[PDB]
A paper describes a structure:
DExD/H-box RNA helicases, from virus and bacteria to eukaryotes, play important roles in processes including ribosome biogenesis, RNA processing and folding, ribonucleoprotein (RNP) remodeling, RNA nuclear export, the regulation of RNA translation and transcription, and nonsense-mediated RNA decay. DExD/H-box proteins often contain accessory regulatory domains and localization modules, but their cores consist of two RecA-like domains joined by a short flexible linker. The N-terminal domain is commonly referred to as conserved domain-1, or DEAD-domain, and the C-terminal domain as conserved domain-2, or helicase domain. Both domains contribute to the binding site for RNA substrates and both contribute to ATP hydrolysis. We used X-ray crystallography to determine the structures of the DEAD-domains of DDX2A, DDX2B, DDX5, DDX10, DDX18, DDX20, DDX47, DDX52, and DDX53, as well as the helicase domains of DDX25 and DDX41.
DDX41 (Abstrakt) post-transcriptionally regulates the expression levels of the insc protein that is essential for control of cell polarity and spindle orientation. The two helicase domains have a sequence identity of 23% and their structures superimpose with an r.m.s.d. of 3 Å. The helicase domain contributes to nucleotide coordination via motifs V and VI. A superposition of DDX19 with the DDX25 and DDX41 helicase domains shows that in the latter two structures part of motif VI is not visible in the electron density, indicating its flexibility. The conserved motifs IV and VI superpose well, whereas motif V shows different conformations in all three structures. In the free helicase domain structures motif V, an important RNA backbone interaction site is in a binding incompetent conformation.
Numbering used by the authors: 406 to 525, 529 to 568
């Protein structure tokens, strides 16, 4: 409820580059969420290739890896944790300065929970595009407005 939500239209083929730029709105720590394992893996490899202290958690990591990352992050030894929703559930995270939603969830319920991982202020960035159904976009729109947040142009048309 008390986070600055920054929702932005980003073509699928442009997110990786934009993500790098995003990391800079904020000092660490940063949590990047994506629905799929493949994605979490891509983003982590990209961040590494660009030189970001980045760790990743998902259902396909073994116990060694999960533990090592959940805790380097939790100590501040790593700036960025990239996670799936399901892998991050119940983890004890520190004060997160910035949530980056690389995906828009299908349910608005889930958008909230993700952005609910920063606050108590902080920034939530959410990449939206063509693939989102109208319904979630309306609920995102409805939410930004109730939250008294910037509505990006692409949503400002939804209902004029």
């Amino acid at each position: 409820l008390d986070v600055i939500q920054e929702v932005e239209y980003v073509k699928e083929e442009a997110k990786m580059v934009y993500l790098l730029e995003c990391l800079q709105k904020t000092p660490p720590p940063v949590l990047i969420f994506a629905e799929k394992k493949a994605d979490v893996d891509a983003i982590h490899e990209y961040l590494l290739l660009k030189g970001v202290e980045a760790v990743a958690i998902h259902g396909g990591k073994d116990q060694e890896e999960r533990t090592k990352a959940i805790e380097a992050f939790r100590e501040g030894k790593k700036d960025v944790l990239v996670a799936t929703d399901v892998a991050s559930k119940g983890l004890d995270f520190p004060a997160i300065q910035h949530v980056i939603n690389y995906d828009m969830p299908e349910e608005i319920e889930n958008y909230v929970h993700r952005i609910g991982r920063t606050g108590c202020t902080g920034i939530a960035t959410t990449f939206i595009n063509k693939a989102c159904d109208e319904s979630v976009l309306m609920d995102l729109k409805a939410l930004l407005l109730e939250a008294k947040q910037k509505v990006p142009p692409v949503l400002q048309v939804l209902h004029c």
